[PDB]
Amino acid sequence: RSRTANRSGIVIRRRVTPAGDIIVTLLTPQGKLKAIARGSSSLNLFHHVGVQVYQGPHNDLASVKQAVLEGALPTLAEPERYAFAHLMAEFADALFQEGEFSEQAFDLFAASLRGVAHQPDPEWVALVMSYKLLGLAGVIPQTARCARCGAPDPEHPDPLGGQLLCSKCAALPPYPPAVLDFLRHAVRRTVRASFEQPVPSADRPALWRALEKFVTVQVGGVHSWRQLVP
Annotated binding-site residues for Zn(2+) read 146, 149, 166, 169
3-state SS, one letter per residue, for 133-172? HHHHCCCCCCCCECCCCCCECCCECCCCCCCCECCCCCCC
Phi-psi region of 166 (alpha: psi -120 to 50; beta: other; left: phi over 0): beta
Extended strands (E) in the chain: 4-16, 22-28, 31-37, 48-54, 62-71
- Judged by CB under 5 A, the stretch of 35-43, 127-135, 145-153, 210-218 that binds Zn ion is 145-153
Which residue of this chain has its Cβ atom nearest to Zn ion in the complex?
149
Q: How many CB atoms lie within 10 A of CB 156?
A: 20
- If the CB atoms of residues 14 and 148 are measured against Zn ion, the closer one turns out to be 148
Interaction between residue 68 and Zn ion (CB under 5 A): no
Determine which helix (DSSP H) or strand (DSSP E) holds 228, and give its type and residue range. Answer: none
- Judged by CB under 5 A, the stretch of 133-141, 144-152, 200-208, 220-228 that binds Zn ion is 144-152
Whether residue 67 contacts residue 26, with contact meaning beta carbons closer than 8 Å, is answered with: no
Interaction between residue 172 and Zn ion (CB under 5 A): no
Nearest distance from C-beta of residue 139 to Zn ion, angstroms: 22
Interaction between residue 145 and Zn ion (CB under 5 A): no
- Judged by CB under 5 A, the stretch of 32-40, 90-98, 168-176, 202-210 that binds Zn ion is 168-176
Whether residue 24 contacts residue 53, with contact meaning beta carbons closer than 8 Å, is answered with: no
Interaction between residue 155 and Zn ion (CB under 5 A): no
Nearest distance from C-beta of residue 217 to Zn ion, angstroms: 17
Query: With contacts defined by CB under 5 A, how many residues of the chain interact with Zn ion?
Result: 6
Q: Which residues contact 53 (CB under 8 A, 6 or more apart)?
A: 4, 5, 6, 7, 33, 35, 62, 63, 64, 65
Task: Return the axis-axis angle of helices 204-218 and 177-185, rounded to nearest 10°.
Answer: 40
Nearest distance from C-beta of residue 123 to Zn ion, angstroms: 31
Interaction between residue 146 and Zn ion (CB under 5 A): yes
- If the CB atoms of residues 86 and 156 are measured against Zn ion, the closer one turns out to be 156
Interaction between residue 164 and Zn ion (CB under 5 A): no
Which residues here bind Zn ion, judged by CB under 5 A?
146, 148-149, 151, 166, 169
